[PDB]
Amino acid sequence: NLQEFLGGLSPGVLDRLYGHPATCLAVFRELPSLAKNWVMRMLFLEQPLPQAAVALWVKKEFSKAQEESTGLLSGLRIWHTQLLILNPIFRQNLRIALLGGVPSLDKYAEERWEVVLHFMVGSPSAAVSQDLAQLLSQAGLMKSTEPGEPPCITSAGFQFLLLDTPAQLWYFMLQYLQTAQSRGMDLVEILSFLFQLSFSDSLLNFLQHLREFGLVFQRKRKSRRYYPTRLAINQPGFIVVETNYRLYAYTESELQIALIALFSEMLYRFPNMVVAQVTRESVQQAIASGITAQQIIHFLRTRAHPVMLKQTPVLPPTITDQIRLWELERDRLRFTEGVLYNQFLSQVDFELLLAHARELGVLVFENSAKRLMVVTPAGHSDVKRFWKRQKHSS
């Protein structure tokens, strides 16, 4: 979430990111319930106040809200104890932010995201863009390994595909920012634009990428002015599920049919409907590709036709249980690197060695009944030395 993204930041980047135009307001809206009230209170105070007052300024009931809000805003570093006055820069910017100093667009965003997903899946016809392809490849959801051949889809790719559009886009933009820092694009400048949307060379490239994603559209041969789409700020279902593992989806866009075929066997395709079967073969194929039953169940539930909404639960218990059992049927091997010792002599002496590999992060599996500790070869030169020291101590 955006709260996680902002919490994972340093004070030096935080105060700079608190730009005058929008950031002080976008981060304010994040404040879930009560911290808004305290920010408004001590927006006009130039004198810090004791912490005991803030502690006792919430009744005994519902105090956990007080502690959680205080911790969240301490992490955000909106104020400092100074002994709880707010940061002067944030106070000034917030005062400046508080009395101081379309139908075609949504369709465009939908179509652009749909073609992006078409390219993501193995669609022969899709929009071509080398920058988009390499960005998706380095986002961790795609791997090519051969420039001549079109890139394939990794295991995480299917999971990302089956996610809903809001979370899908949000995670995609999170990965975009994380890779922006890697490629060298300043994070603060690009981040501030997202906040400003909900109200330079790097800016131009970032806006080009956003337009490729379909969140914005200049509409004037790439002019300075832009008109953000609905997705920039941040529908009825069509699938009918039977009790015999049969799906009737009122789908005209090929994207939905492809998504359904990812985990179902298609039987018929009518102009305004398509018939598929959820069989062991298709479900286990999806599970092997990497999906888990939770994504499939959530996808079918969110794309649930209004006819089956009346029944509770919306998705039949037999279908849900069968999908879950099919996914459980498979349990899979793992991969790690390690080295094992033996002849550990005294018992109380083996317990002290277990804490050496656990603190350094090179321990995989321990055994106090046989004395059997696995150590990765990456930290083999540090565990052996410790063992030698212990032997010397005797």
Partner 1 sequence: KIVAYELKTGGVLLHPIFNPASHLHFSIKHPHTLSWEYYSMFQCKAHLVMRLIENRISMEFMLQVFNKLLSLASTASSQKFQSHMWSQMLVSTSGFLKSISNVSGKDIQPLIKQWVDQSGVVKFYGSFAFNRKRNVLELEIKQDYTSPGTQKYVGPLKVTVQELDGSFNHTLQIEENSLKHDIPCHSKSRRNKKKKIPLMNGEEVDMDLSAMDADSPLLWIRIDPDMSVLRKVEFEQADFMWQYQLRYERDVVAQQESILALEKFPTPASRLALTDILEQEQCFYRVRMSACFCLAKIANSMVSTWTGPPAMKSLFTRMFCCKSCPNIVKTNNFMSFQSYFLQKTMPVAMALLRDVHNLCPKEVLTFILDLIKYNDNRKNKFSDNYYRAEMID
Can residue 342 be called a binding residue for partner 1 (CB under 8 A)? yes
How many chain residues are in contact with partner 1, going by CB under 8 A?
10
Binding test (CB under 8 A) with partner 1, winner from 344, 360, 364, 386? 344
- The nearer residue to partner 1, 83 or 348, going by C-beta atoms, is 348
375: CB partners within 8 A, 6+ apart: 338, 339, 340, 341, 357, 362, 363, 364, 383
SS3 (DSSP) at 54: helix
Query: Would you say 254 and 266 are in contact if contact means Cβ atoms under 8 Å apart?
Result: no
Q: Which stretch binds partner 1 (CB under 8 A): 58-66, 129-137, 149-157, 364-372?
A: 364-372
Binding test (CB under 8 A) with partner 1, winner from 53, 99, 333, 345? 345
Q: Which stretch binds partner 1 (CB under 8 A): 53-61, 118-126, 339-347, 358-366?
A: 339-347
Least Å from the CB of residue 385 to partner 1: 19
Can residue 346 be called a binding residue for partner 1 (CB under 8 A)? yes
What crossing angle do the helices spanning 187-197 and 23-30 adopt, rounded to 10°? 70
Least Å from the CB of residue 371 to partner 1: 7
- The nearer residue to partner 1, 212 or 366, going by C-beta atoms, is 366
Binding test (CB under 8 A) with partner 1, winner from 294, 347, 368, 390? 347
- The nearer residue to partner 1, 333 or 348, going by C-beta atoms, is 348
* Placement of tokens 């997202």 in the chain: 194
| DSSP class of 246 | E
Q: Which stretch binds partner 1 (CB under 8 A): 107-115, 191-199, 200-208, 344-352?
A: 344-352
Least Å from the CB of residue 341 to partner 1: 9
Q: What is the DSSP string of 297-358?
A: HHHHHHTB-GGGGSSSSSS-HHHHHHHHHHHHT---------EE------HHHHHHHHHHHH
- The nearer residue to partner 1, 91 or 371, going by C-beta atoms, is 371
Binding test (CB under 8 A) with partner 1, winner from 371, 373, 375, 383? 371
- The nearer residue to partner 1, 250 or 341, going by C-beta atoms, is 341
SS3 (DSSP) at 169: helix
Looking at 33-164, list the stretches that DSSP marks H as alpha helix, in order from N- to C-terminal side: 35-41, 51-56, 63-76, 88-97, 103-120, 130-136, 155-162
Q: Which of 243, 197, 192, 246 is nearest to 217 (CA)?
A: 197
Catalog residues that contact partner 1 under the rule CB under 8 A: 342-348, 370-372
